[PDB]
């Protein structure tokens, strides 16, 4: 897609950010800002300009599922692509995400190969 596309990596403080930020730099994307949780994220998102969200599921103040929900509700950014990247592989977690309108799901641990395919899949489907 476009190289100037703005991403927001929502992850408290684990290895997810260093991994994802790096894999994104490799695919060509350099415009990447990070957040610690749903709250911080929503604030940063109000500034506008963002075109893609990548987030964990378990974070304090607001988990990934609530953030997902909050994003879909808000009309100004109801279509913003959101990709969940979490350890949670149960039946409840995946269905919740599908119902809420997740763009995609990636289970941890994952490999660079997968994350790149999950991104490139969503890029086609949406036409970025």
């Amino acid at each position: 897609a476009d190289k100037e596309l703005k991403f927001l990596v929502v992850d408290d403080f684990s290895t997810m950010r260093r991994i994802v930020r790096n894999l994104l730099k490799e695919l060509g994307f350099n415009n990447v800002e990070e957040a610690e949780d749903g709250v911080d994220a929503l604030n940063k998102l109000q500034a506008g300009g963002y075109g893609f969200v990548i987030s964990d599921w378990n974070m304090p103040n607001m988990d990934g599922l609530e953030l997902l929900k909050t994003i879909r509700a808000d009309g100004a950014m109801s279509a913003l692509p959101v990709l969940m990247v979490t350890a949670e592989a149960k039946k409840e977690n995946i269905i919740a995400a599908a119902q809420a309108g997740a763009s995609g799901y990636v289970v941890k641990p994952f490999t660079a190969a997968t994350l790149e395919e999950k991104l490139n899949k969503i890029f086609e489907k949406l036409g970025m």
């Binding site: 408290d12 304090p60 103040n61």
Partner: protein, 117 residues
């Protein structure tokens, strides 16, 4: 993730012998003292008082440990250990992380205690 946050082996023992009262009572004290602690931490960081940071870390590590909040205890373990390689570069993030999740951790603990009993 509830296992990476709590010291389950310790808590299950507490429940068997004594009961939940001591944990909740102790957690009650922690919830009151904690806000003060992080504030003092934050201060010493900007002021760059090395001994300050280390000392307060030792206090939170103990405070958290006694009530079974494993990740906090661990996060305090690192802050009070300035001999660790690249302590200076990574210490600030461990503090911002302490400030970010302490309340959530407390919540996950109360929750587990209820369900447990």
């Amino acid at each position: 993730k509830s296992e990476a946050l709590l010291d389950i082996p310790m808590l299950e023992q507490y429940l068997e012998l004594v009961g939940p009262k001591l944990i909740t009572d102790g957690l009650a004290v922690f919830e009151k003292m904690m806000p003060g602690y992080v504030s003092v931490l934050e201060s010493n960081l900007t002021a760059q008082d090395k001994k300050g940071i280390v000392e307060e870390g030792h206090k939170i590590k103990g405070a958290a440990g006694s009530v079974g909040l494993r990740h906090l205890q661990q996060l305090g373990q690192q802050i009070q250990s300035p001999d660790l390689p690249a302590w200076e570069d990574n210490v600030g993030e461990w503090i911002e992380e302490m400030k970010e999740e302490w309340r959530h951790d407390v919540e996950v603990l109360k929750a587990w205690v209820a369900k447990a009993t």
